[PDB]
Structures are given as structure tokens and as C-alpha cells.
Write a protein that binds this ligand. Structure first.
Ligand SMILES: [Ca+2]
Ligand SMILES: [Ca+2]
Ligand SMILES: [Ca+2]
Ligand SMILES: [Ca+2]
Ligand SMILES: [Zn+2]
Ligand SMILES: [Zn+2]
Ligand SMILES: [Zn+2]
Ligand SMILES: [Zn+2]
Lengths: 108, 108
């Protein structure tokens, strides 16, 4: 049976395809598809981005490294990598040591 | 509420910590912790590695880029990146177009 780790990897890919298949090339994200994905799937991790079209505009341009106005899977995974690392760092910030009790924030 | 994508990112980090916290430094994987994680969490994605200590030995040495005999989070995420890309490619191989029906293999 698929492990928690394998399920998580598959779900990341499935989520990308849920938005990439809507219009244009079915394996790339148009601006509209990327914004939809960010607002629906990263509304907590990218809370300031969902309500701010401005930062989404910067991020699309940063990720679109071949300047073809769509995000390939490989281009979009640069964002996933940044999010994973940021979440790891924030998880540690929210779980300080030495309090003799647990914390439950996770990452934000 | 956390999205499927956010849940997947958190679960990846939680799975790393489930094995990194067992011994030694609580935020790095010893050889024993890494092998345990691979055998328990990547038994399908890395099916040939779980039953083959040999390939796990190569992978640990490839990932341990500072040669300190443990995998940091950053070092271990190089493996996660390779797995995500490999799963994406295999998902496409298992879902050929033009058959007029669905396929259900996912990635392996
Ligand atoms: Ca598309
Ligand atoms: Ca592009
Ligand atoms: Ca450890
Ligand atoms: Ca190391
Ligand atoms: Zn794809
Ligand atoms: Zn506290
Ligand atoms: Zn950690
Ligand atoms: Zn078929």
C-alpha cells in the first residue's frame, strides 16, 4: 500500500494536473491556472499572495524562467521546493525546545 | 483549512522528522534512520532499494554531500525532488493518450 510519503508526492502531482489541464497545454499552468491553484491550494501557505494579485504576478514571472508565459512542471516545482523548505523552517520556529509541553501550529 | 497540497507538504516534513528524531541529532537521518525511512516509506517508489541494502548505500553516499555520515533535511530533499520528478514522468508513461479510456497505475 502507498505510504504517507508516497501519497503526498502523488497528491502534489495530482494537484498540479488538476489546474494544468484546464486550458492551453494540459501539462503547463497558464497565468489563470497558476493564480487559481495558488488561491485554492496555497491559501494558508501563501495567505498574503491569494488576496494580493501583485505578489502572484511577481512569482509567476520569477518561475517562468524560459519566458513563455506558462509554468512547466519543472518550473512549478521550484515553488514547491521553496515552500517545503519554508514550512520546515517555520515548523521549527513554532516548536521551540525546553518548554516541557507540545505546540500545535505546524507551519504557516 | 489546509489544502491537499499543504497537507502533502506538511506530511513530507512530518515523515522526515518521524525518522530523524529516533537517534543522534534529532533533525538529521543517520544511516539506520535513512534505511528505515526508505524501507517503510518508499517501499513502492524505491521497491528495488528496500530489499537491496546495496542501492541504499549508494544513495546515502550520494546525498551526504558534506560527508558527515548523516542526511540533513536539505540533503534529504534532493532525494524527494528526484522522486517527485520521476513520479511525474512515470505517471505520464502510465497514462498514454488516445485510448479512449482511463488508466489507474499512477506512478511506480
Ligand atoms: Ca494548462
Ligand atoms: Ca515557462
Ligand atoms: Ca537522527
Ligand atoms: Ca550530511
Ligand atoms: Zn504532467
Ligand atoms: Zn511553549
Ligand atoms: Zn526539522
Ligand atoms: Zn489503455
Amino acid at each position: 500500500a502507498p505510504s504517507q510519503m508516497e501519497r503526498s508526492i502523488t497528491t502534489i502531482i495530482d494537484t498540479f494536473h488538476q489546474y494544468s489541464r484546464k486550458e492551453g497545454h494540459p501539462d503547463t499552468l497558464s497565468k489563470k491556472e497558476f493564480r487559481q491553484m495558488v488561491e485554492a491550494q496555497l491559501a494558508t501557505f501563501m495567505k498574503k499572495e491569494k488576496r494580493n494579485e501583485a505578489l502572484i504576478n511577481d512569482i509567476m514571472e520569477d518561475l517562468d524562467t524560459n519566458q513563455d508565459n506558462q509554468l512547466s512542471f519543472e518550473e512549478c516545482m521550484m515553488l514547491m521546493a521553496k515552500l517545503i523548505f519554508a514550512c520546515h523552517e517555520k515548523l521549527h520556529e513554532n516548536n521551540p525546545r525546553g518548554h516541557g509541553h507540545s505546540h500545535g501550529k505546524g507551519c504557516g
